[PDB]
Design a protein around this ligand. Sequence first.
Ligand SMILES: [Br-]
Ligand SMILES: [Cl-]
Ligand code: NA
Length: 296
Amino acid sequence: SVVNKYLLHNRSIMFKNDQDVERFFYKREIENRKKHKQPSTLNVKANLEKLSLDDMQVFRFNFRHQIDKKILYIHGGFNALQPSPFHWRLLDKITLSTLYEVVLPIYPKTPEFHIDDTFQAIQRVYDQLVSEVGHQNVVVMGDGSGGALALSFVQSLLDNQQPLPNKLYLISPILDATLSNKDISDALIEQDAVLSQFGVNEIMKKWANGLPLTDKRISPINGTIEGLPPVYMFGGGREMTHPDMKLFEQMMLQHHQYIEFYDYPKMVHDFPIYPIRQSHKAIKQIAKSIDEDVTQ
Ligand SMILES: [Br-]
Ligand SMILES: [Cl-]
Ligand code: NA
């Protein structure tokens, strides 16, 4: 399996019990305070800018001096993990394929920080980028829990009458943090070697800081749909989020909101982070679609 071939134990949320959860939070509190660094062995092909915004680390990737257009990238990791070395590699590839400048904020993480900290930080970097190139030249993208953050954040902009990004990209978004969709079968659960209902529940409960997991800011499947910019979603049939992605697609369609869903039946959660041909195909689909004229 691709999951096992590239496994990082320090990113696993397959917790057995409360004791594993506590140990994870203990570890993440300590690790999250450290300055995040590019992987020591990774050749990043794009040019890299190591910036900060109000003491938050922000990395920017650009290629061939192409910076007139931005992707605000919200990385996965359940709001507890920092970017994977495979996230570094994915972002590099997207930069080189799209020729947008990819912006990677290291936003506040749980267990020390909580939902409002996370969202206020994303707002600040979004505002920064809009001031640089205009909202029409900014695309928002995220994977996993980062896809949830990305959708929830654009929904916040929409609810608050803020200028919206030209497009919104969701990669294996965790649209409902409860993962209680009754269409999630045992067969589907047995195919998913990455997600854990227990792990996602427990981590998200910590981050939510007293808010119910069903709150639309946490589970954006429950958030504003009408008025969204065009949405482009990527996911696999072997991830427990798949019923939620299909449900979200149905809701977008019903509300006459533009959605492209690229659904890969045999792919795993967050598949584009893996060095496999399907990832390269997904990246090419991002590149081909990202410059489509927005006429909605
Ligand atoms: Br596939
Ligand atoms: Cl599970
Ligand atoms: Na910045």
